[PDB]
Design an enzyme around this catalytic site. Structure first.
Site, PDB file in Angstrom:
ATOM      1  CG  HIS A   1      -1.609  -1.161   1.555  1.00 33.80           C
ATOM      2  ND1 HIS A   1      -1.490  -1.813   2.766  1.00 33.80           N
ATOM      3  CD2 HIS A   1      -2.479  -1.891   0.815  1.00 33.80           C
ATOM      4  CE1 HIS A   1      -2.272  -2.882   2.762  1.00 33.80           C
ATOM      5  NE2 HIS A   1      -2.851  -2.976   1.581  1.00 33.80           N
TER       6      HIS A   1
ATOM      7  CG  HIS B   1      -8.577  -1.728   2.651  1.00 35.68           C
ATOM      8  ND1 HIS B   1      -7.429  -1.325   2.007  1.00 35.68           N
ATOM      9  CD2 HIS B   1      -8.549  -3.078   2.656  1.00 35.68           C
ATOM     10  CE1 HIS B   1      -6.717  -2.380   1.665  1.00 35.68           C
ATOM     11  NE2 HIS B   1      -7.380  -3.458   2.035  1.00 35.68           N
TER      12      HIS B   1
ATOM     13  CG  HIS C   1      -8.055   3.406   1.459  1.00 35.13           C
ATOM     14  ND1 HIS C   1      -7.658   2.502   2.431  1.00 35.13           N
ATOM     15  CD2 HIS C   1      -9.184   3.977   1.938  1.00 35.13           C
ATOM     16  CE1 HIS C   1      -8.477   2.562   3.458  1.00 35.13           C
ATOM     17  NE2 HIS C   1      -9.404   3.456   3.189  1.00 35.13           N
TER      18      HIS C   1
ATOM     19  CG  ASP D   1      -6.667   0.256  -0.645  1.00 36.71           C
ATOM     20  OD1 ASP D   1      -5.873   0.452   0.338  1.00 36.71           O
ATOM     21  OD2 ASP D   1      -7.920   0.356  -0.489  1.00 36.71           O
TER      22      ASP D   1
ATOM     23  NE  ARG E   1       1.802   1.073   9.263  1.00 30.43           N
ATOM     24  CZ  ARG E   1       1.309   2.298   9.109  1.00 30.43           C
ATOM     25  NH1 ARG E   1       2.103   3.293   8.726  1.00 30.43           N
ATOM     26  NH2 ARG E   1       0.003   2.532   9.333  1.00 30.43           N
TER      27      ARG E   1
END
Ligand SMILES: [Zn+2]
Ligand SMILES: [Zn+2]
Lengths: 154, 154
Positions: free
Chosen positions: B47, B72, B81, B84, B144
């Site tokens: 993303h 999303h 988004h 995305d 992440r």
């Protein structure tokens, strides 16, 4: 439209720092401040380079950001690259507490520096007054100690 | 008006990669391609996040880039988004070869992703179809693992 940006400067030696940018109005100056440590005491060239490409470390950032194809100068000069922010000065501890205000770079428009690379250099930028060929390109500021891509900030 | 962008992904662990973006027409799609290594075998959320701020690593990148305030979804869904981009797939050697074409992101104007952060995530993005709140925000793609600011490329 962006009113704030930030850059995390990293390199292969002891030089690292965080630099903030703020531009409250698109027709007004960009304030640039932050702290870089690890630097030898005295003046270090401080420039926005054309590319936000760190695939080969600082080398792949390319030359100073120069959309109007001018010669290198100091930030007060009419003849300068857009990326020519002049020098930052490190104290006896090796810390540069940067404080610059510039009205040629922008965070929007043709002179937008978001997504480009900020680089702190090994030597003083001579602000285009060195009288050699290199002075008119890089200010004789020497190698790239630390750099980062300039990103949009909250 | 940028036609090429690049992103070097790094994080605290072994996940590393380079992702290229190319958009030959301002009103045309963007090609996104490159390679990420150090990943667990399987799917990982991929993303564009809102801030190109790495001051606290990938956390300071903030949420998915969502200028139109949608929910999303997957990159082929109309409700998504702007940031995305679905999942990438890592093979048994931990390498994901990324090759996508996207018509929602742009390298110029209001959907422009230059200066924002590309993030590769710990788990599969469920594409907004996992039926809890978390799915409609982040796709439950979790931590992440690596990120970088998306920079203008030559
Ligand atoms: Zn210059
Ligand atoms: Zn999303």
């Amino acid at each position: 439209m962006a009113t704030k940006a930030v850059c995390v400067l990293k390199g292969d030696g002891p030089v690292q720092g965080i630099i903030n940018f703020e531009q409250k109005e698109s027709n007004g100056p960009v304030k640039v401040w932050g702290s870089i440590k690890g630097l030898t005491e005295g003046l270090h060239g401080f420039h926005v380079h054309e590319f936000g490409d760190n695939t080969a470390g600082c080398t792949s950032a390319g030359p100073h950001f120069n959309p109007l194809s001018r010669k290198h100068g100091g930030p007060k000069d009419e003849e300068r690259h857009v990326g020519d922010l002049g020098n930052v000065t490190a104290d006896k501890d090796g810390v540069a507490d940067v404080s610059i205000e510039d009205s040629v770079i922008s965070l929007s428009g043709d002179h937008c520096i978001i997504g480009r690379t900020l680089v702190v250099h090994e030597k003083a930028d001579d602000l285009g007054k060195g009288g050699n060929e290199e002075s008119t390109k890089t200010g004789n500021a020497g190698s790239r100690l630390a750099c980062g891509v300039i990103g949009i900030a909250q």
